[PDB]
């Protein structure tokens, strides 16, 4: 639907701070999709949510670990080693262009193409950074889509896409003519 | 073929991992065969499932293989035979759910230190990377299996796919001498008009 | 009398 | 038909030894098509098959002669001249995207970008190898399509499709869940 | 003017080989006009034949012209005056269609050594390439003419294109003074 | 009366 796609894109663009803590998001999603699991239902939102939940719950911890590893490695690489410039590393598009696997060799020939003589301790840092970038992009997209599909399953597509729009508008406008407080789904707060 | 038994068998995970084709041509044929439903904007269950798993693989398999290769290149650098590799102390997929999302490296290095306080930073990195790569590889194997399953189902029906795998397993469990001179397949018929 | 495909796919035995 | 597209892809994906030799293929294709020519029919398979036969009869000889001329120039090339590596040899997709005319100049600038000065003989050798590669790709596609349409004409389309699917599946299995005998042409030979 | 005579005069191969358009423009126009029927997955006679000829044209022509320029370079760096080229001994398509599809090169070598058994390797190569170029060029000219024919037939119609071509020839025959400044067109 | 195409297209004279 056109309004649904509008809300979906506006979600994709959202400021990343209104999305709740991923931990509680996942906990509530896998606590609220349990009944449909027991009932074997196959609704669209149910499928997408119970799949992105598995994806996140499987690949978020390792990505955060990779980031921590890269941050620990930056401290131990020898100093003034001329860090790799941003944009030269393999990104998502050329990555998915590369066939499955055989990407480490491409990153390696790329890092040597910029600096033939580069310590392995920093080649590893660059590789980890470039991998975690892709992982985090995909996982953020998944988090967003999960929040959307889940809140839609809870309240209704045509009741959440009339909140995404109000929020987008109030969020673009400047502060003076937009009241003082943001809009919420009155069904949450109504006595 | 007692339909109940046939259904209770033929669970995808009951496959030796040699039957599935390579990931490359697997995803290739999956895309080339589900593109019609994509362009026609289908909503079918199996289509959705194959699409999700295809995106998952296409996004994360590259990075998992890269992490394996990084573990290798790093083992090529670690102090040789100066650091006994600790098994078991590292956490596999099962204990992952208990750990909150994020702060996994915290627990991992905490255990590594409880094992060897003087553990060199580099071998520490290698252990972390190998553990994470195993965690991802298990789930990617699962996703590959489910993708093959949902794809062959989209093609030939779950009633026929589960009836085929069932026959395949009870064939593999039949001695190579008395199996016969044929293998159970899935018929792909096209009668004329 | 189907298999225990709780979600759309089939889970472990 | 989606099944026809599947069959075309399957044909494009085959071991390249399952097909018969060009000589006998063209022989029996003409021997089975001549009557439709004399009767002035326009069946799709007839059209495609006769056009592909004309193509092959017109270009396979020249392609093979080109290969042999390359192998003969390799006897006069100065020794240990470092034959050009791939990547500096234009392939089919680049040949398709580059304008219809003046392909030799692009190949020349590419080989000189690889090595600034390069002997005329080895230049010729590389040019011929690339051109013959392109022609061979095209003629392989043509041979496959010709066998497909000719056997489709002589034994219907459905049976050929069934056989092709069965055989491609038999080939795409890891030798352990396959059998001990590949599906044989008798399948389409017989009626149904 | 009259239908039977117009139908018996119309034969693409009667054209002067210059009224035809440029190959690249022709191919571009044919591709752009077939794209719709392609996506519709039709089975029309003209569509099939035209797409086949277009594929042939975009794959062979490039290698054909390439071969020509290669032979030209070899002649430029051949023994300049010595080793005069063999006139007419080279085989054309009418003969090449007879030899098996494997060993045209052997028969060409036989012809060359028959004319002269003491002939340099590079001149040998240049001659072989020139002959192959002539063969492929004849075939590609036929292909171009058939492509133009079927393209315009698909666009307008065979009844119209035939009558049109008939008028074109009857205008080429007339003298430049008493003919029209311009040649006719389709849909007149 | 029509020039029946020997092959699918129009051949030479």
Residue numbers in the entry:
A (entry chain C): 2 to 192
B (entry chain D): 1 to 193
C (entry chain H), F (entry chain E): 250 to 262
D (entry chain B): 2 to 193
E (entry chain A): 1 to 188
Question: What does the paper behind this entry write?
Answer:
Particularly striking is the much larger size (~260 amino acids) of their single capsid or core proteins (CPs) which in mammalian HBVs comprise only ~180 aa. In line with earlier data the major type of DHBc CLP conformed to the clustered-dimer T = 4 architecture known from HBc.
The 3D-map of the CLPs had a resolution of 3.7 Å, but more importantly, the extension domains were clearly visible at the same threshold as the core of the spikes, indicating that during long-term storage most extension domains had become folded. Local refinement of the orientations of these particles further improved the overall resolution of the asymmetric unit to a nominal resolution of 3 Å with the extension domains still less well resolved than the rest of the asymmetric unit. The core of the spikes was formed by four helices, with each DHBc monomer contributing an ascending helix (α3; residues 44–78, 35 aa) and a descending helix (α4; residues 120–157, 38 aa). The ascending helix α3 was kinked in the center between F60 and W61 and tilted away from the dimer axis in the upper part of the spike. Moreover, DHBc helices α3 and α4 were connected through a 41 aa long extension domain (residues 79–119) whereas in HBc this connection is just a short loop of 3–4 aa. The extension with two short helical segments (αe1: 92–99; αe2: 103–117), was positioned at the side of the spike close to α4 of the same subunit and in contact with α3 of the other subunit. As independently confirmed below, the packing of the extension domain to the flank of the spike was stabilized by a salt bridge between R124 in α4 of the core spike and E109 in αe2 of the extension domain. Analysis with Intersurf showed that the extension domain increased the inter-dimer surface area from ~1,900 Å² to ~3,400 Å², highlighting its important contribution to the intra-dimer contact. In DHBc the seven N-terminal residues pointed towards the lumen of the capsid, without contributing to the intra-dimer contact. The pockets at the base of the spikes close to the N-termini of chains A and D contained density that was not accounted for by the so far described model (f magenta). This density resembled a short peptide and was modelled with the 13 very C-terminal residues 250–262.
